[PDB]
């Protein structure tokens, strides 16, 4: 068409990225406890 349906808010995208970041952080946190060579957390 041309221009396209313009997004006004950008807060939804911020929420998506914040949620993705938090989830990846939790994973990265418990990523070294995986497998036989994985270690414990206190």
Partner 1 sequence: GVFEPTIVKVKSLKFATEAAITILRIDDLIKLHP
Partner 2 sequence: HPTSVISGYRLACKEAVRYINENLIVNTDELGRDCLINAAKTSMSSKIIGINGDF
Return the DSSP state at 3: S
* Distance separating alpha carbons of residues 3 and 8, to the nearest angstrom: 14
Residue 2 annotated as lining a ligand binding site: no
| Residues in contact with partner 1 by the rule CB under 8 A | 32, 39-42
Q: Is 38 in the site for ligand ADP (CB under 6 A)?
A: yes
Q: Does 39 bind partner 2 (CB under 8 A)?
A: yes
C-beta separation of 32 from 38 below 8 A: yes
How far is 40 from 17, CA to CA, in rounded Å? 29
Which listed option, partner 2, ligand ADP, partner 1, none, makes contact with residue 12 (CB within 5 to 8 Å by class)?
none
Which residues here bind ligand ADP, judged by CB under 6 A? 34-36, 38
């Amino acid at each position: 068409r041309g221009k396209g349906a313009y997004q006004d808010r950008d807060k939804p995208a911020q929420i998506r990225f914040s949620n993705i970041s938090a989830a990846k952080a939790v994973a990265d946190a418990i990523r070294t406890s995986l497998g036989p060579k994985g270690m414990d957390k206190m």
